[PDB]
Design a protein around this ligand. Structure first.
Ligand SMILES: Nc1ncnc2c1ncn2[C@@H]1O[C@H](CSCC[C@H](N)C(=O)O)[C@@H](O)[C@H]1O
Ligand SMILES: [Zn+2]
Lengths: 86, 112, 94, 76, 179, 366, 176
């Protein structure tokens, strides 16, 4: 046993001034009320498609920690290149 | 001096393994090449070729033709779900597209 | 007399007659399948070579090819191609 | 030299051979009279394996003796 | 309660399929789609306890107006064996389900068939059929008419010439007859 | 015992089928003779028994404080033998759970086993010293003499019939001993690699015949036949029936067992928690299985007469059998669900044709 | 003068010669429009090959029958079984006489002198049993329920192989 990992929330943990705040960094004037659920869905899809490749490189390297270079390598594969962590 | 069991039949495959080992030594991909990689890679390439040719043959029968012309290949890839995601940014020559008309461009009738 | 060139025509012929008895193939379809296998080979060998440079090793084993296939192919097709590869290698050993 | 080869199945088989024959002669004779695949003609000399790449006179068995074959898959 | 003399026992024939949880919701060329049909007709539909009359064929996947639904397949008979099989099925106390294709033959559904026997009748349908050619052997293919949602029991019209048996289904604008 | 008309193409396990989410902290697993029960040891020194047909938890018995790491069933299915770091020769009942034997003897034990026919003879494998055979009533203990005495890691067992005692050191030398008179009738060093020897982890046997397994430490499972050892006798040089390994991941193994019919071999990773199944005869992998992708495998069982496999990971015992498919004609055999146009004309006795018991069977027999 | 165009089962192997047919997958009772009303007329049925599970019912039927319906239902048609000699007519099961073999020269004769009938099973011109009597109004067509794939061939010409002994008929090459 010893492992307490019963987690159900944390899609709601991206709260609801936060998507409003991102939208008003984006230059958006007036928002409806279904944008919140749709944004949570799209964020879940994207973080799945990055964490999958991150854990794959971490396993293939035969380690247990996901260092920053592996995240940079996953995002390099995706096409969204990231600078400033190597 | 012994029996020349080629690495195709010694494995149980159909893709050659000598040509794969030559194109992994002479591609400057690494210095040293193992002796499980060209076998494993020949198997992967065979399975993908079988996967597309199954659906190609089904469509080729189902349009009542003998051979396979590339319109069947276009239909066989783009009807499937995972092969379309693999061949993401790919244009097959002489391909054509799926027949698709939107829902509002065609008329409908109300009276009588 | 011309200089001998590579092609994968005969092996597509053999797999086609193993999976369909009486269904031929054209010329253009053969060129498409040739370029398709060339594409998949280039992508997988590139991913394995990049893994080998990341891990500070120098040798393509089978392990890197398995990792490259698990990365590049989407989901269930990867879960079948891994089994195909492992079965072929284990029938090659003994 | 009429050797006996009684296997572990009660399958006794006889070959009247020379003491100076090779393994290939025994393979040909058993493959003639039974069609047994010759990748399983392993024999035992006081526990130890009788290897299939030498002659019969390299072991000096008493003439007209009894041996035992093992049903083996080698090249599947 | 065993000393009680409950005699609801045997007033109907032998068959059943009732008491199922019959509440799911409250709410290309030809042969390729024939392959699609043989694929997905199992996961599309379902037979459950109707409120109309006994059982019926429900619907679960949201169908667009025009696609194939199921093939109504069973044994294959000709025009002679009708009265003989009807006399046998009446002798054993079995309802007779048949469907004519054309001017040649009729497909049975009594002794061998599929999960497509169990569509009731209405006069405002949402299904029909045509005649196709899967290599000479023609077939009985269930098209659709409009966008059918989940939970709806399915219906189709029987093309009866108006010619005994009353209307034991109860549609809305029905003519109080099958014929 | 079960349905005989059931075999509509029976299979070999594919699915996950649901597990025992009841008590964690499992440590080992083994079935009885027929394949109806399963003893499972806890972490604190308890026993979990699960019945199969009812799918119900049979009995929970608290043995001691030391963790239970070795178990075996008697032939009738009434005497459980076990040993642990508690150093105690134990013997337990299945109707009561009684401490029938209690002898705290040192160098704690790694494996126990009954003689497969007499339950008087029991196996004891110490921490260091040579393996010991005992009796039940008195303390007649038989330590088998070992020429090595340098590994302090010797494995030994009894085979299917209990004819002989196959023994093995951690240098890879085998000393076959007769089961009662300790006759050293056969010996062989394992032909490991090119020349260099290896250790021996465990040795198990079958349910039908004399094919068995060798679990070395160079990642190579070897399969021999015991009658070949008998045909060799002393100074044997056996070469195996079939060799087993997976060089793709280079995976050393943790546990092996055979099928019920001696046809299939399962063996489990020590790294990936992924089970493999082999054919004995033709000699290839047939299926890879998976599970929770990051857990550490402990112990694998098999069910003899029916394709059911028990795993152990994170104290969870999985059960994998087909997720079997049910259909019609069991509710109504007069109707059979076809698929397409089936023609019915082959019989000719149609179109109005009209033509022109004595077995006494017992009812309370066996 | 060939096999029938109108009065045939359309799925039969009516080949380019239109004399030999392979039986289909039912009681394919093919008829012929060259059938008698009254008089003295006889032809042969030169059956050649008859595989097992390919039965054949022999008789004379009236034009208002069905192509797929087997012989011997009512007053239109009279049937009879190959094995065990068991005629079936008007929903009656009667094990009657001796059967036939395989690929013989069959063909029956019927006579209506100007109400009374000559109904005898003629197997190579041999008396094999009197089937029925007193036939009713209608034309009489040769109807054989060809059961499965068999090799039968109708005979037309005057070179009769087994003609009936001292029985008089106008030859069947004088109608078409
Ligand atoms: N609404 C209705 N109530 C009773 N019978 C109906 C009906 N609509 C059609 N029928 C007749 O009854 C048959 C319906 S099949 C009835 C569904 C299924 N067999 C069941 O038992 O529940 C058809 O042959 C049709 O002729
Ligand atoms: Zn109605």
């Amino acid at each position: 046993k010893r492992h307490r990992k019963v987690l159900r929330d944390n899609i709601q943990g991206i709260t609801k001034p936060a998507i409003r705040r991102l939208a008003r960094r984006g230059g958006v004037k007036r928002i409806s009320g279904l944008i919140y659920e749709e944004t949570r869905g799209v964020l879940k899809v994207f973080l799945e498609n990055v964490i999958r490749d991150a854990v794959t490189y971490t396993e293939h390297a035969k380690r247990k920690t996901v260092t920053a270079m592996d995240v940079v390598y996953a995002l390099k594969r995706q096409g969204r290149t990231l600078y400033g962590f190597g | 001096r012994a029996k020349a069991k080629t690495r195709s039949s010694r494995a149980g495959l159909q893709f050659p393994v000598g040509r794969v080992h030559r194109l992994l030594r002479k591609g400057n991909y690494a210095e040293r090449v193992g002796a499980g990689a060209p076998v494993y890679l020949a198997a992967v390439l065979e399975y993908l070729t079988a996967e597309i040719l199954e659906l190609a043959g089904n469509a080729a029968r189902d349009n009542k033709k003998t051979r396979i012309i590339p319109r069947h290949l276009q239909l066989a890839v783009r009807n499937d779900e995972e092969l379309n995601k693999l061949l993401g940014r790919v244009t097959i020559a002489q391909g054509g597209v799926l027949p698709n008309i939107q829902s509002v461009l065609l008329p409908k009738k109300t009276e009588s | 007399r011309k200089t001998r060139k590579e092609s994968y025509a005969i092996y597509v012929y053999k797999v086609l007659k193993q999976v369909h008895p009486d269904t031929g193939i054209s010329s253009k379809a053969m060129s498409i399948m040739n370029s398709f296998v060339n594409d998949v080979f280039e992508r997988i060998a590139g991913e394995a070579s990049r893994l080998a440079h990341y891990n500070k090793r120098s040798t393509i084993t089978s392990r890197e090819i398995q990792t490259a296939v698990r990365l590049l192919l989407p989901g269930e097709l990867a879960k079948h191609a891994v089994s195909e590869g492992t079965k072929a290698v284990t029938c090659y050993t003994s | 030299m009429q050797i006996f080869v009684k296997t572990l199945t009660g399958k006794t088989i006889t070959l009247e051979v020379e003491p100076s024959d090779t393994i290939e002669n025994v393979k040909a004779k058993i493959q003639d009279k039974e069609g047994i695949p010759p990748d399983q003609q392993r024999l035992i000399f006081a526990g130890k394996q009788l290897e299939d790449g030498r002659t019969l006179s390299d072991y000096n068995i008493q003439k007209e003796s009894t041996l035992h074959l093992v049903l083996r898959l080698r090249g599947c | 309660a065993r000393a009680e003399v409950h005699l609801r026992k045997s007033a109907f024939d032998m068959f059943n399929f009732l008491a199922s949880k019959h509440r799911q919701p409250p709410e290309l060329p030809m042969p390729m789609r024939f392959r699609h049909l043989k694929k997905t007709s199992k996961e599309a539909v379902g037979v459950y306890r109707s409120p109309i009359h006994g059982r019926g064929l429900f619907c679960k996947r949201n169908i667009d107006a025009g696609e194939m639904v199921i093939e109504y397949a069973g044994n294959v008979i000709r025009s002679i064996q009708t009265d003989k099989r009807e006399k046998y099925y009446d002798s054993k106390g079995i309802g007779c389900y048949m469907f004519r294709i054309d001017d040649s033959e009729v497909v049975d559904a009594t002794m061998h068939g599929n999960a497509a026997r169990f569509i009731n009748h209405s006069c405002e349908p949402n299904c029909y059929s045509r005649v196709i050619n899967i290599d000479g052997q023609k077939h009985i293919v269930i098209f659709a008419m409009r966008k059918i949602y989940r939970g709806e029991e399915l219906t189709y019209d029987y093309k009866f010439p108006i010619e005994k048996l009353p209307c034991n289904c109860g549609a809305k604008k029905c003519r109080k007859f099958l014929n | 015992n079960l349905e005989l008309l059931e075999s509509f193409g029976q299979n070999y396990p594919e699915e996950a089928d649901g597990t025992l989410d009841c008590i964690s902290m499992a440590l080992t697993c083994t079935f009885n003779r027929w394949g109806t029960l399963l003893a499972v040891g806890c972490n604190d020194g308890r026993i979990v028994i699960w019945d199969f047909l009812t799918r119900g938890i049979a009995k929970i018995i608290s043995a001691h404080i030391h963790p239970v790491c070795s178990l075996c069933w008697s032939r009738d299915g009434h005497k459980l033998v076990s040993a642990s770091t508690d150093n105690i020769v134990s013997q337990w009942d299945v109707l009561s759970g009684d401490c029938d034997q209690r002898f705290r003897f040192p160098s704690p034990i790694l494996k126990v086993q009954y003689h497969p026919r007499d339950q008087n003879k029991v196996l004891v494998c110490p921490m260091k010293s040579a393996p010991v055979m005992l009796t039940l009533s008195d303390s007649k203990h038989v330590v088998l003499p070992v020429d090595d005495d340098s590994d302090l890691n010797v494995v030994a067992s009894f085979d299917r019939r209990g004819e002989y005692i196959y023994t093995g050191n951690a240098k890879g030398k085998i000393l076959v001993l007769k089961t009662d008179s300790q006759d050293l009738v056969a010996s062989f060093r394992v032909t490991t690699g090119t020349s260099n020897t290896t250790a021996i982890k465990s040795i198990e046997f079958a349910r039908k015949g004399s094919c068995f397994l060798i679990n070395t430490a160079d990642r190579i499972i070897r399969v021999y036949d015991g009658r070949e050892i008998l045909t060799c006798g002393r100074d044997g040089e056996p070469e195996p029936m079939q060799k087993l390994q997976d060089l793709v991941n280079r995976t050393p193994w943790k546990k092996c067992c055979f099928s019920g019919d001696g046809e299939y071999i399962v063996a489990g990773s020590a790294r990936q928690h992924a089970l493999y199944i082999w054919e004995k005869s033709i000699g290839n992998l047939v299926k890879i299985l998976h599970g929770t992708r990051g857990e550490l495998l402990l112990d694998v069982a098999w069910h003899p007469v029916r394709p059911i496999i028990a795993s152990i990971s994170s104290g969870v015992v999985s059960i994998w059998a087909q997720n079997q498919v049910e259909n019609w004609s069991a509710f109504a055999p007069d109707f059979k669900e076809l698929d397409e146009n089936v023609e019915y004309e082959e019989r000719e006795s149609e179109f109005d044709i009209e033509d022109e018991e004595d077995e006494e069977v017992d009812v309370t027999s066996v | 003068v060939l096999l029938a165009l109108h009065d045939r089962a359309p799925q039969l192997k009516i080949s380019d010669d239109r004399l030999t047919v392979v039986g289909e997958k039912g009681y394919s009772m093919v008829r012929a429009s060259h059938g008698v009303r009254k008089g003295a007329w006889y032809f042969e049925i030169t059956v050649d090959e008859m595989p097992p599970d390919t039965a054949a019912r022999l008789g004379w039927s009236q034009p208002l029958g069905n192509l797929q319906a087997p012989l011997g239902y009512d007053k239109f048609s009279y049937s009879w079984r190959s094995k065990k000699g068991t005629k079936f007519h008007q929903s009656i099961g009667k094990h009657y006489s001796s059967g036939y073999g395989q690929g013989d020269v069959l063909g029956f004769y019927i006579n209506l002198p100007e109400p009374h009938s000559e109904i005898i099973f003629y197997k190579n011109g041999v008396n094999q049993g009197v089937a029925y009597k007193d036939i009713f109004e209608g034309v009489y067509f040769p109807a054989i329920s060809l059961y499965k794939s068999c090799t039968v061939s109708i005979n037309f010409g005057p070179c009769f192989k087994y003609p009936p002994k001292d029985l008089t008929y106008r030859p069947m090459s004088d109608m078409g």
